[PDB]
Amino acid sequence: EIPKPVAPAPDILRCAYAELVVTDLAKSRNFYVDVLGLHVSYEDENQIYLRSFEEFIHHNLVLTKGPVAALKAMAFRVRTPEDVDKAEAYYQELGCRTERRKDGFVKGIGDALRVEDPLGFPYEFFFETTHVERLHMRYDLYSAGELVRLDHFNQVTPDVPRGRKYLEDLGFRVTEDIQDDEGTTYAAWMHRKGTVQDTALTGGNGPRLHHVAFSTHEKHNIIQICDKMGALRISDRIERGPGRHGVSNAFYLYILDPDNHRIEIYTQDYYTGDPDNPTITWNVHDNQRRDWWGNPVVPSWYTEASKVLDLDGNVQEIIERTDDSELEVTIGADGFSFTRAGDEDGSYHGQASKG
Amino acid sequence: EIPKPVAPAPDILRCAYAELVVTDLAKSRNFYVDVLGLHVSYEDENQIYLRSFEEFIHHNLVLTKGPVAALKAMAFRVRTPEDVDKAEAYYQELGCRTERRKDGFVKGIGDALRVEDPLGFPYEFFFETTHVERLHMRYDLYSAGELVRLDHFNQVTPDVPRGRKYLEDLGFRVTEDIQDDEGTTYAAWMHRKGTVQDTALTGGNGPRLHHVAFSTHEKHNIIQICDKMGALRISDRIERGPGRHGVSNAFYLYILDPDNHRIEIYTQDYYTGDPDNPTITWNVHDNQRRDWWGNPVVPSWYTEASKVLDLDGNVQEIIERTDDSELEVTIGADGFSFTRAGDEDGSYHGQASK
Amino acid sequence: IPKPVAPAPDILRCAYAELVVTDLAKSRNFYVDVLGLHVSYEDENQIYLRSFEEFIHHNLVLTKGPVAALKAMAFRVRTPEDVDKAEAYYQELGCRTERRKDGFVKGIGDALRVEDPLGFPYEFFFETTHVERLHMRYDLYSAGELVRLDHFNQVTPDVPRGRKYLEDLGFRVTEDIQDDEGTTYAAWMHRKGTVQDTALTGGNGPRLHHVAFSTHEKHNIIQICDKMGALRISDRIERGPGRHGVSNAFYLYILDPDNHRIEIYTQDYYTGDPDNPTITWNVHDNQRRDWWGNPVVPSWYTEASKVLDLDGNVQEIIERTDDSELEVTIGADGFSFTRAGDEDGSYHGQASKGFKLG
Amino acid sequence: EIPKPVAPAPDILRCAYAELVVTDLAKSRNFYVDVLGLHVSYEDENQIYLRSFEEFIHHNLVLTKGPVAALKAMAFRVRTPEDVDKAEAYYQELGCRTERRKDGFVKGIGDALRVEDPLGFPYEFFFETTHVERLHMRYDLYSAGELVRLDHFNQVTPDVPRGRKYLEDLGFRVTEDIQDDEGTTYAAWMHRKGTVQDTALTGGNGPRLHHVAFSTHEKHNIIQICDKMGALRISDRIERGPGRHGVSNAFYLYILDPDNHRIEIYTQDYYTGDPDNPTITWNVHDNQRRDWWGNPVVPSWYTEASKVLDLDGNVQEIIERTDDSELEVTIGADGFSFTRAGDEDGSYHGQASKGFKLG
Numbered sequence A: 001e002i003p004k005p006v007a008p009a010p011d012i013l014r015c016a017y018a019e020l021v022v023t024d025l026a027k028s029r030n031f032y033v034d035v036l037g038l039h040v041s042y043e044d045e046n047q048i049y050l051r052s053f054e055e056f057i058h059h060n061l062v063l064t065k066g067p068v069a070a071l072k073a074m075a076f077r078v079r080t081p082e083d084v085d086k087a088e089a090y091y092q093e094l095g096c097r098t099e100r101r102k103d104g105f106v107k108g109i110g111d112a113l114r115v116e117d118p119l120g121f122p123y124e125f126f127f128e129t130t131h132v133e134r135l136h137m138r139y140d141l142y143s144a145g146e147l148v149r150l151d152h153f154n155q156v157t158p159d160v161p162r163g164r165k166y167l168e169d170l171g172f173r174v175t176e177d178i179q180d181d182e183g184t185t186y187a188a189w190m191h192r193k194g195t196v197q198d199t200a201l202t203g204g205n206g207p208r209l210h211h212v213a214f215s216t217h218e219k220h221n222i223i224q225i226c227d228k229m230g231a232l233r234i235s236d237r238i239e240r241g242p243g244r245h246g247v248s249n250a251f252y253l254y255i256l257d258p259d260n261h262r263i264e265i266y267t268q269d270y271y272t273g274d275p276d277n278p279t280i281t282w283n284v285h286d287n288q289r290r291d292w293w294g295n296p297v298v299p300s301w302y303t304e305a306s307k308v309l310d311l312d313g314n315v316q317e318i319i320e321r322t323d324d325s326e327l328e329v330t331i332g333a334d335g336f337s338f339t340r341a342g343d344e345d346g347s348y349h350g351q352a353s354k355g
Numbered sequence B: 001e002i003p004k005p006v007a008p009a010p011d012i013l014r015c016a017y018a019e020l021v022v023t024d025l026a027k028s029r030n031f032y033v034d035v036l037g038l039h040v041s042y043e044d045e046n047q048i049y050l051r052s053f054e055e056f057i058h059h060n061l062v063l064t065k066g067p068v069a070a071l072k073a074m075a076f077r078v079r080t081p082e083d084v085d086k087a088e089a090y091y092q093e094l095g096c097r098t099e100r101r102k103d104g105f106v107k108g109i110g111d112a113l114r115v116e117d118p119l120g121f122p123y124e125f126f127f128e129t130t131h132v133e134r135l136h137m138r139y140d141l142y143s144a145g146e147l148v149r150l151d152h153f154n155q156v157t158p159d160v161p162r163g164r165k166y167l168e169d170l171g172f173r174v175t176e177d178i179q180d181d182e183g184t185t186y187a188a189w190m191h192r193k194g195t196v197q198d199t200a201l202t203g204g205n206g207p208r209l210h211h212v213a214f215s216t217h218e219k220h221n222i223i224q225i226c227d228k229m230g231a232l233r234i235s236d237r238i239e240r241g242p243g244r245h246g247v248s249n250a251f252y253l254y255i256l257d258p259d260n261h262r263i264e265i266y267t268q269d270y271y272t273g274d275p276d277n278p279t280i281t282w283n284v285h286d287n288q289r290r291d292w293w294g295n296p297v298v299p300s301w302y303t304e305a306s307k308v309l310d311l312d313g314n315v316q317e318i319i320e321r322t323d324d325s326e327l328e329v330t331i332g333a334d335g336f337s338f339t340r341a342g343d344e345d346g347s348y349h350g351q352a353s354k
Numbered sequence C: 001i002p003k004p005v006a007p008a009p010d011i012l013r014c015a016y017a018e019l020v021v022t023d024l025a026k027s028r029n030f031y032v033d034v035l036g037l038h039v040s041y042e043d044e045n046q047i048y049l050r051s052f053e054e055f056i057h058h059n060l061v062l063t064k065g066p067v068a069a070l071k072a073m074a075f076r077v078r079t080p081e082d083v084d085k086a087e088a089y090y091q092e093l094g095c096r097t098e099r100r101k102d103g104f105v106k107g108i109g110d111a112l113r114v115e116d117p118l119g120f121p122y123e124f125f126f127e128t129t130h131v132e133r134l135h136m137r138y139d140l141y142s143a144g145e146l147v148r149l150d151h152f153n154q155v156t157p158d159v160p161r162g163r164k165y166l167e168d169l170g171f172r173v174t175e176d177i178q179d180d181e182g183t184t185y186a187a188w189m190h191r192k193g194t195v196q197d198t199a200l201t202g203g204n205g206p207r208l209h210h211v212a213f214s215t216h217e218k219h220n221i222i223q224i225c226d227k228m229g230a231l232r233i234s235d236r237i238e239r240g241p242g243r244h245g246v247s248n249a250f251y252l253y254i255l256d257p258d259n260h261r262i263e264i265y266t267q268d269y270y271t272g273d274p275d276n277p278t279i280t281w282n283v284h285d286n287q288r289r290d291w292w293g294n295p296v297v298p299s300w301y302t303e304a305s306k307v308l309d310l311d312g313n314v315q316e317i318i319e320r321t322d323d324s325e326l327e328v329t330i331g332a333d334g335f336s337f338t339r340a341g342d343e344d345g346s347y348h349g350q351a352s353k354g355f356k357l358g
Numbered sequence D: 001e002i003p004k005p006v007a008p009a010p011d012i013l014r015c016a017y018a019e020l021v022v023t024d025l026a027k028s029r030n031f032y033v034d035v036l037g038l039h040v041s042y043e044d045e046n047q048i049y050l051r052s053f054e055e056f057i058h059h060n061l062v063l064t065k066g067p068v069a070a071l072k073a074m075a076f077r078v079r080t081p082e083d084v085d086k087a088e089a090y091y092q093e094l095g096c097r098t099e100r101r102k103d104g105f106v107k108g109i110g111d112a113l114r115v116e117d118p119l120g121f122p123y124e125f126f127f128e129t130t131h132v133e134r135l136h137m138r139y140d141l142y143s144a145g146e147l148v149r150l151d152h153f154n155q156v157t158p159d160v161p162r163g164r165k166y167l168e169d170l171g172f173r174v175t176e177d178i179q180d181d182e183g184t185t186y187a188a189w190m191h192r193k194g195t196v197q198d199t200a201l202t203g204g205n206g207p208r209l210h211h212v213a214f215s216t217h218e219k220h221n222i223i224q225i226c227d228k229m230g231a232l233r234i235s236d237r238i239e240r241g242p243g244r245h246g247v248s249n250a251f252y253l254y255i256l257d258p259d260n261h262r263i264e265i266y267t268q269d270y271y272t273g274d275p276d277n278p279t280i281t282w283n284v285h286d287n288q289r290r291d292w293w294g295n296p297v298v299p300s301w302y303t304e305a306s307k308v309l310d311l312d313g314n315v316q317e318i319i320e321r322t323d324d325s326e327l328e329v330t331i332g333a334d335g336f337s338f339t340r341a342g343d344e345d346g347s348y349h350g351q352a353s354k355g356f357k358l359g
Ligand SMILES: O=[N+]([O-])c1ccc(O)c(O)c1
Pocket: B154, B213, B245, B246, B247, B248, B250, B264, B266, B289, B290, B291
């Protein structure tokens, strides 16, 4: 168990940006700018800084050329400059490795703290950031598939309860989770900004980054991303969806970038900002929990995820999950799922839904 | 081959309605009225007559209680009363069994001809029908999943070229098809009304009815049907989709009624009314041909379809396809498909996609 | 206008308009950069444009000239022989015709242009150069994509006279607007099984009221408005967006650099059955044009494009003598209602929603 | 100027519900339930309690039968029980009348404080509320026009800077405003929950309630409300819209209930939760500021609004605005608006846009 520090937690506003290491900056640019339409805040020969349509902070995504594709930092903005001090004291008490840079790690961010957190993830906390033109009314630029906000991160970690307690102490509130009747937790979702999630934990071998998620305005915008990928004859990079989630209630899609970093497109979850927001727990065998329409979850969604780096830029060692596997208990040879609890009709034994 | 009659073909306007035999009328009512929101044109203890939001003819669907669920008739509206006579002469010349009822087979249809067509399907041709309130501006009745038009039928038949030529002789024009390099035809789509299809042929054991399709206004209306089915905890009756079709370019969904009759929801195909409308042929191994996004086609979509009846109400015997199977050549053990022709990356062998 | 003995040509649909424009570059910016139409051909004299789902060569030809005007509204006919039928039909009507075996504009073959009995330059053709049908080119699809040509709309002074002539030509009336004293203000009529291929608006004419393009969805029309706001050209949004009464379509009217009016349109209904029910609206029904009762801007009733004769000269305007829709609905002596017979929700001497004429 | 109390401000979460007095409860029920599709939490012969599709607190709207239609309370939820005490101390320090009911003023609310605020508005602060079934996945109930959340209130008040400062001290941050070049503020928008607004100030004679706003998921849901009102032949109850706002960037519609209470339908504004969120100031003469497409703002939008009650249930006296009128300076006889700053072309002098004048 990760202890609760005496030191006060920093006041975290929201997920703000991810730094992803990519192997071929031009191929990555083509995906994120030409295919997906993200907006360039800054670029050079080593990095591309990208933002969503409604963003005013400098960026939501930094693509950094490197030898090994991986998550380098998942950054959360805090409420005040003093909250970066609070973050530093909090993680030091946790016994975590930290590094503070008054002029930032990436362009457009000022005083920033990176940490190797108790789950092995590279978290950044910052307040100071360079404001840019907020493009929210630039309908002359708006794409039929426009990505309008950064919504969340999702982390693969082997022990979900352990991670959950730590994030709650940090001020994240759990909104939804997946458990079974034998005391196992498979996943949890947790927030600061008053949507379903700013980050989320998926049970599995980790630390690995499961995905970064961007929002659209409407469901047809997600449909258009699929249609465009069909026209570009890259439909093989559509991993899963489009669908309606059970957990979160959002319309969604998962696609794969050139380094197999997974990107979710997401819209129309609900408000969670009240402190007694009702927590929703799904059973792992409920075939409407991940896709509300019962569409099967492809095995790659459970097994594949991105490496993460430590503060020296080296890949974190992966620790094996020993708790039961969501893949195995739902779609593996001895798995089970149901449509209606207690009804044999519409249940699946040893296979995925829909044939 | 089915020879072309010397008798002139009836002038067919469009698909108009289907009569489905159902085993439990109340359960079927629940599905078509309460889940799907179709509008009641007439009902009693034996039948429910239903129409879409924009329809002015009496109905687009008749649910008839009976012992064995099946298609009883797929009905096309013809241009004039005289076209019913032309239909009778045409099918008589083909040597088909016909039945003419001057006052109709179902309520709200007048003079009507039913035939056991050369592919074993029960076709009806009629002109006269009772007009009803056209609900196209009744937004006080509009559902979040509103079904707005009847769009098409899809028939399973063993020899697609044979059926295609017969339908061409009847004035249907092929818009799209699926073939391979060996010259096998797996499916064809063909129209009268100036959309992609009024009926369609799927290669397989037949005669069987693959589906009846209704359209929505927008893609979100199809999404809502899925969402509603999840809320009703009947997501197991979502068979395939939602998706974008390759063939037709329509946004689509397939669902299953209480007797396993398959219903497609469909929107936003394209205009085909010019007589030189370009015909599109897809390769059977193209994994974007059926679902443009490359999502796999579940085997039940290829293998399962509804029985059809003869004019006595008995189930039509089935003839097994001898041409190659689309299922087998794409997703079966010796099948394959591609994302990009000639590229092993994104190809699938002995396996479906994704 | 008498019904010829000669058979009418079999008309499939509206197919394209040729508009004369004064500044080709400014017109290009509007139709290509703002509206996203697709270039089939262009040079210093003309720009040929098509919608997303079209396979014929073009739906719009922009021709540089001194005086902005409609030069031709073109209908495609079913067979080559129907061009001969059109020629014989209009000759019997006593109309001026011109036949060009190799077309008037690029990508059209054998074509007949006529100065029709209402003074409009109609073209009939079958032969056209097929192009890449872009209907699945989602790599090109814009948030405001125009997917088809839907219809034309013509200003003419005597609507019944025009209606009868178009009925003889094979168009079928779907909807109209009349009053209780027997005046007709507008009529809509079709060949292709939608609400309209052309339409008549009562007023001084011949003038071209608009050309209409379709979108897939209502949000595509909303995006056009949003984009025009972002470009700071919201003053070129004339009217809308709205829901029509007549046609039931979602709509918008915008103005090109020469004030040619373009409608964007979606989700009208099927009309292909021969006994398709006609719908007649009362002129005082404030839901007939905008279903939500939003006021119809006066320019919509007064402004429209000049049309040319076959020499390229502007057609003389003939004044409407029947009552004016503007005057009887939104002028100082006008009225409209929300519910027939109800004073609540009625408007007298002004438009709906609190406005009078500017 | 309203002074900043020494006492700490309550921590306000969000707007939570309004109580509207209505004259004919059945007619009001038909509007809010049958026309608009709000979900009944409770009703009797005197009150109807309604919530939106995604709500889990007891209600977002209470309709209370009474002799004079008016706003009775605009209610904000606070973060903790202790924040109700803080609200009481805060308003007392401001010299405002307060009333505390341990078991609530309306059903499904617990310990609650109502106040006559410094602008004459009846505010409620509460934490405790009865949870109900959250209908957010009840797609079997979902309407083509479904109202999914309560979004905001909008208040008419004569002195916008005076109100703005008071609300800022209370912790609301201004996200957008409308000013001119002569020092006049015509309107301001301010939030707690991280959308553009939880409440808003519109310059005018007040206190009056301008509107209550509900959100939809998508723009087509707003269009459906319009379409349905046409089918019901109540298009005369569509006041303004649908449109795209400049301020807020939301797609919108304004409609009028049976007592002329104005309801906004709203979707797809942007995130404001960062504390340095950029404040956007529009010039009052910019004809894209209220409707981005330049559609004219109907004069009733500027002149009509609902009465508000004091804690005794009597109507609050109206105080006249002396600052310049947005109506007058934009669409009135000496008004002006532009499409492009400094361009005569597309400007409007002494009339509205798109060919209209004031009736
Ligand atoms: O591509 N296919 O799977 C198709 C295309 C159109 C259809 O109507 C259909 O039922 C199947």
